[PDB]
Amino acid sequence: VKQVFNFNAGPSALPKPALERAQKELLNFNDTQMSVMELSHRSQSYEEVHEQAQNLLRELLQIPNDYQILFLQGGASLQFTMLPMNLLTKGTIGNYVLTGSWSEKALKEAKLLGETHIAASTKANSYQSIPDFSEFQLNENDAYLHITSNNTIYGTQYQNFPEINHAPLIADMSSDILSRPLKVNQFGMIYAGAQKNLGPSGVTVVIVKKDLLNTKVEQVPTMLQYATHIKSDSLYNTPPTFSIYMLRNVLDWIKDLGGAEAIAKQNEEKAKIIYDTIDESNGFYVGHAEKGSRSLMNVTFNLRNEELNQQFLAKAKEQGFVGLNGHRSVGGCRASIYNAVPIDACIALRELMIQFKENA
Amino acid sequence: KQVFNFNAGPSALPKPALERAQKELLNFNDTQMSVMELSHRSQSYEEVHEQAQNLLRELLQIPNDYQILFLQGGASLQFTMLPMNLLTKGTIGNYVLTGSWSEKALKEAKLLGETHIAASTKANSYQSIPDFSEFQLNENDAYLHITSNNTIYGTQYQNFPEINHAPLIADMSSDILSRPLKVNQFGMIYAGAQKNLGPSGVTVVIVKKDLLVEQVPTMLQYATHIKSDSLYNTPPTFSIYMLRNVLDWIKDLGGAEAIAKQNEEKAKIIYDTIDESNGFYVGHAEKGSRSLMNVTFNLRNEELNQQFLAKAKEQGFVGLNGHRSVGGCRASIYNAVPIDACIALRELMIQFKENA
């Protein structure tokens, strides 16, 4: 039928082959004559999937052997409280770098549980950039330093990651995990809801340095201890089996296209198509981010006034574009271009943007 | 290629729900996207989300003063979320112990506050539900918690106690919407979907609104999710979609009373087989407490137990091994397990007995 271009911000476009694969075996997985959704998570067919999803992630990001991969429910939002619940002990400080709204939500939850600090923030200038690492105020009693690698709502992104030795570096990578190569040993823990760049909603990937968190924390509910899930290999209680399966399928696709290094090349190219369009528009489109901080995953921009914003977004929706409205808290526009968004969608958006501009 | 799915969790689902999911997996509602590819703030998703709630409300006849929540973390997270929200200082989390899942819930409450055992059939290895006249209740109970169906032990409440000093709270993971319910008896009901309602990944929480908070993490407050209609953060959208589909199937067959008829016939097939076996098969539960959802039994010795389960597996039956904590056999016959599978089990049970 008509064209559909999926720029949804979360959940988001999946790679077609992962969906086609799921569709074909939805009723009979691995010749069991059952859906993967109808299997015991103690079955060997399921355990194979669970282990493969882990091994693909390990290979793709080159995760070291002293790290474990957890598959948890609850979203990144639950990690906002689980992290300080496990690591923010008395006399210690949850130190946060604020580079958008998701960073503030993480901070707020630690505030409920302990001493917090703000190491650096670009909030004053409306989160248009990543602060310089030299501005980071660090504390000897920091439990960790927490960052948001990709600021989904504001369209900014870390180009690289700080070297931190006094505390573990923790990162909310929900909207850019496995969009590029990563030196995992820079971190104590990485977490990501899967629904932005790794597949479906319902599972959260948590990559953790085992010895930072494989020990029982007194007074913490069993389900909320990392130790619980480390010890049980994310099978303490029933996992989100279809979500993990779909995650597996998406990881297979990333591997098939050449891994993190190849997908970064694709992601830089799609992003360039949109940013060049903005940059050649003579101010008709204005990107929110400063150029050195532009995200490769979420492109945020405004037209010159809200009336034009609305007409542009209404025209897009009529032409088949989905999800371009900016986050409700900031307005404007947001083109989410995660791994699986195809480049011809980006070209289509460029065409839209140029004809709208020329015809305005 | 015959397979009979007696898995205990996650479990068999209705074929029409899975076929419907398959057919539109790539193009949901003519959007040309999977339901999995939709924003949870889209109208497209929002209608599915609401439709799932509406079907539960209809099918269980849930009054207006109850809210229906879709949460992540399984029934296991509810074990701690409940006392986190309701077990305030100077109050008591009171538990009725009718199996190991009861025990797991009580354990989490003990982390957070004072607990109490209203009644327990543990001494007799959980062969029955205690007499409600036996309950020991406290003026300062924050709640009375029960497990409606004791998944590992094969026992089930026939009816529920009339409790007015405190909210009655029930872990209905393995029997929710397998029969009609009087929801007004409860302050809260919760269940992982993965037994009777859908795939794993979503937990249904039915809560008396005005019943349920300084210092609890935002995600762990019921009020967060009540206030945001379970859209505070990204919900498990595909699991809720599948839950909708399963609920449409239950509605289509005639609702909670109709599925109870089917379930009672399924259970009747197996229990009759056991009772007519002259002691060859022995059920764990006392008759008066027999579950309609998990039928637990053993052969006369461990070696016959093992021979039977091996024969079963060879013949395409899946999931009949009892829980590791108790051994024996367990036939889980949740809503979507078809009567034909129970008939097949019976026929295997009878043939095995003849050939022993």
Ligand SMILES: *Cc1c(COP(=O)(O)O)cnc(C)c1O
């Ligand atoms: C989407 C997002 C979240 C929220 O994830 P949920 O799974 O909805 O809790 C948190 N952090 C970032 C950076 C996100 O983009």
Ligand SMILES: *Cc1c(COP(=O)(O)O)cnc(C)c1O
């Ligand atoms: C299956 C079950 C649970 C465990 O549910 P999860 O979703 O695995 O946490 C809890 N209580 C009962 C009665 C169950 O049958």
Ligand SMILES: [Cl-]
């Ligand atoms: Cl942000």
Ligand SMILES: [Cl-]
């Ligand atoms: Cl977002």
Ligand SMILES: [Cl-]
């Ligand atoms: Cl039990």
Ligand SMILES: [Cl-]
């Ligand atoms: Cl069980």
Ligand SMILES: [Mg+2]
């Ligand atoms: Mg491959």
Ligand SMILES: [Mg+2]
């Ligand atoms: Mg194309």
Ligand SMILES: [Mg+2]
């Ligand atoms: Mg219908």
Ligand SMILES: [Mg+2]
């Ligand atoms: Mg008879």
